[PDB]
Amino acid sequence: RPLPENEFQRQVWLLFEYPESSGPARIIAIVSVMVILISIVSFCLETLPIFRDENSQSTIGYQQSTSFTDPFFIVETLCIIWFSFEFLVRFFACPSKAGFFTNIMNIIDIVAIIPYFITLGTELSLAILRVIRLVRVFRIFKLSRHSKGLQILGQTLKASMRELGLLIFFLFIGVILFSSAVYFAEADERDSQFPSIPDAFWWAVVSMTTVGYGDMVPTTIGGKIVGSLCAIAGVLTIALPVPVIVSNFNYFYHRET
Amino acid sequence: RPLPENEFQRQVWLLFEYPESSGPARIIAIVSVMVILISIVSFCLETLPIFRDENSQSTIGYQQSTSFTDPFFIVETLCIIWFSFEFLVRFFACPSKAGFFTNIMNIIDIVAIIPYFITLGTELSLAILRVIRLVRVFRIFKLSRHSKGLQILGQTLKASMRELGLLIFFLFIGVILFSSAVYFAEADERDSQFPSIPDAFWWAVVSMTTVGYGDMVPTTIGGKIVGSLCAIAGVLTIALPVPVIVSNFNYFYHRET
Amino acid sequence: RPLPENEFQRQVWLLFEYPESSGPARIIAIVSVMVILISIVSFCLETLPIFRDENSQSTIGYQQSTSFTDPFFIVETLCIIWFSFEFLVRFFACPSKAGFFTNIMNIIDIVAIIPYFITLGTELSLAILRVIRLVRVFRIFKLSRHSKGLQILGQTLKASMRELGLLIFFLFIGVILFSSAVYFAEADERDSQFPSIPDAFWWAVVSMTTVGYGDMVPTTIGGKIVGSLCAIAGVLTIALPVPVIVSNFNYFYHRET
Amino acid sequence: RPLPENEFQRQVWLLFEYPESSGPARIIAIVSVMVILISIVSFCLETLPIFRDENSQSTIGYQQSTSFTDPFFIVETLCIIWFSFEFLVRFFACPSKAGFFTNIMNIIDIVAIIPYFITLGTELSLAILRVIRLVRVFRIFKLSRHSKGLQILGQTLKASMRELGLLIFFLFIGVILFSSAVYFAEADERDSQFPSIPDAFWWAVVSMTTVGYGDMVPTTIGGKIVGSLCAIAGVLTIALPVPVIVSNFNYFYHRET
């Protein structure tokens, strides 16, 4: 039960525990939010056809160079430097080092920083590279550190795991059912847009969610009846656990007041 | 209502009354769930153009043979064998089989095994083959034996028969009304995409459910006004009994907790 | 209310007003419902290209002949005869002829029976004919006499006129606003799909109701931003009075039970 | 606050502020509403190719001529004259000019009239003219002075700024997430319809709102999985703060009685 005796990490953590307490903490929070937003904007803009063409050493999406002529690389490195500085500052100033991984927002940053170390280690299947370049985008969720609403969203999704699982399960059941029905209904037609049941999965999903795309549509009377049933059942299926998820969100949203 | 008096039938009833009794029961349940999922995956994959096209012969979709060279047929036979074994095991314990079929879950399995007897009978008057090949898909509903959420869905649909019937009735009324209106609105146009009122039923259902496909759309001012009314009335009609169905689902969902 | 006191009209009123009173009344009600359904089916099937082509073919809308070889004409005449018989039978039991225009259910029947007989009478200044040809479809609402659910729908719409009018007003405001915005956003484009604001009304309606057709879509950045705002505002606008209308429907639906 | 004490401005204020006070006030209110509707109709009709071509008449929005012989320009000037007369009449009824920071009606009016003053100044370099022609559309919101329902809408939007901001934030997060996912999923295809992430923003918005256009759709298995997730998450995200906004609307709707 003895005190830590460091007298500096605890002081910094107490100072940065209430960002509204002092001006410098609010300035730092604003700088962090602006840097996150700048990183998001740069990430989105890097994929434009004007810049992407004029950028393994090619499948990784970036080429390391000392000169760093690409402005997008410079901005990415600057944002990575700021993120690393913030992570180290919070890691060296947390009084509860053993329970440092209790905050989810820290796990998000550690997950975002793992791929760089993994790449460095493995440098000395193929879907891993695609999924890792995909997982790069999730520095968006680092906005949950400053946004209270996104924290309420996270708590709602954590407390509504069973209901969301039921939603996914009901959608899956209905999708297979109606895809099978519409594939067999329009099976004896050469103009049919449903070559197979897995292909009809896409139509079943875009009809059950009532999105409606028109890329694949029924053409037979039986196919159209199955499509009508698919739309009705999709409404009836989505509407069941959404109220429970909404009640959870309302609870975690009004819990503050 | 005399008791069996055998002194062992009560023991079997007690043993089969508590599925959670032992670990081997959990293992058997897991094996059954995996077998159902494997059967669903195999059934969905059987229809891919890679296997079906590159193997009467088209009306049935499968050829029964003693050799059983097709891997999909092998998996189908294995799953059918497991289902038959489970059904026989659960049926060999019922003294009064006459009232045994009060549960819908056993009717689902007897329906899933109907295709075997139908094929046997027809091996030794056209809709029967297509309907049997389609009813082959309802082995999904045998997942309701293991899933509590799908049981709550079944209870909700049982207790919401009147409200679902009202939904269907209101949808039918609005569909005919607006299909007639949009057919007569765009009747004096040779470029119209509504050849007849039954052909406009498809547009009415995909607009009233607010799915929206674009394959058939109005082109005249009157047709567009009718389409606007169709969308508004479809929202207003779907939204009426969905809250009652949702209340029923919430009741049967919080009853278990 | 009070009984007629005539001692003979009351018997016929109880016979033709309460189907549950006696078996013959139930049979008559079933016959009436089936006749309405047959009339609806015949009306829908008459417009099919197989039959409509092979029927003053525009001013009257039907060919009168003594032989009446057309099955659709025979069915229409039989249904009209039955409707006229029912209307006369029920009108012979109404003492208050002056207050006959008070019940909306009888006004619906008289309006649905006006077209054919009034056209025949005037056969032996132009919009009236179109109005009559449109109103011929409205015998569907004669099912509200036998269906309690459609009566609850009618009561809900009658008691929710203000909120439904607010819904229409909000949709009109949003439609004009977003159609103007999307027309001016993509005004300086030759490939633009919005020639004018009234032409963009259709897109605004199908986006606000979140139906989504794709026949007319934005192509500019400003047009796409306006479309995003249109979809969001459409959800936010439809969702406001629908709960009130649903509360009214639930009240009038649980009032009977 | 305190009355002007002039004994004349009060009479005009009561005439032009309380339509229910007297018959002439109701007549004036009806005339104003009809004038706003006529102006809206004329503004919408001005953009039709029938009139706009047969009148730059598009960049400035008006035809400058000494004769001013066009009757439609006369109608527009008459509507502007009536609006100016109403504005002057109500401006002559404000006693305390120093208390400008207390009434929100004066702030709204001054903010709305500043662009009119800029237009007057510039009457006697490209985006300004387009934005002024677009801001001309906001006479639609002048109907809020007479409509109570649109006042309730305004109060609901003013009291639900936090929930609407959360809705926009969640939509933005999901849009960027799923646009990135669908761009990277369908990146290794020559026929891909997602050249870049900002281009996939439109698809993410029209899928998450469940509108569904079909102009740009996924074609790969990964793209289709991402689209399914996009639709589900869009429903789950839109449905969260809409109940709070609806509760606010219901509160401000029933607060009147």
Swiss-Prot record, chains A, B, C, D:
Give the record's membrane topology. Answer: Multi-pass membrane protein
Q: Please state, per the UniProt record, what induces or represses the expression of this protein.
A: Up-regulated in brain cortex in response to ischemia (at protein level). Down-regulated in dorsal root ganglion neurons after peripheral nerve injury (at protein level). Down-regulated in pulmonary artery myocytes in response to chronic moderate hypoxia.
Keywords attached to this Swiss-Prot or TrEMBL record, sorted alphabetically, are: Cell junction, Cell membrane, Cell projection, Endoplasmic reticulum, Endosome, Glycoprotein, Ion channel, Ion transport, Lipoprotein, Membrane, Palmitate, Phosphoprotein, Potassium, Potassium channel, Potassium transport, Synapse, Synaptosome, Transmembrane, Transmembrane helix, Transport, Voltage-gated channel
Q: Where is this site: Important for binding with the scorpion mesomartoxin?
A: V217
Q: What does this protein do?
A: Voltage-gated potassium channel that mediates transmembrane potassium transport in excitable membranes, primarily in the brain and the central nervous system, but also in the cardiovascular system. Prevents aberrant action potential firing and regulates neuronal output. Forms tetrameric potassium-selective channels through which potassium ions pass in accordance with their electrochemical gradient. The channel alternates between opened and closed conformations in response to the voltage difference across the membrane.
Entry text on domains: The cytoplasmic N-terminus is important for tetramerization. Interactions between the different subunits modulate the gating characteristics. Besides, the cytoplasmic N-terminal domain mediates interaction with RHOA and thus is required for RHOA-mediated endocytosis.
What is the name listed in the Swiss-Prot or TrEMBL entry for this protein? Potassium voltage-gated channel subfamily A member 2
State the gene name recorded for this protein. Answer: Kcna2
Give the shown range, full length included.
138 to 421 of 499
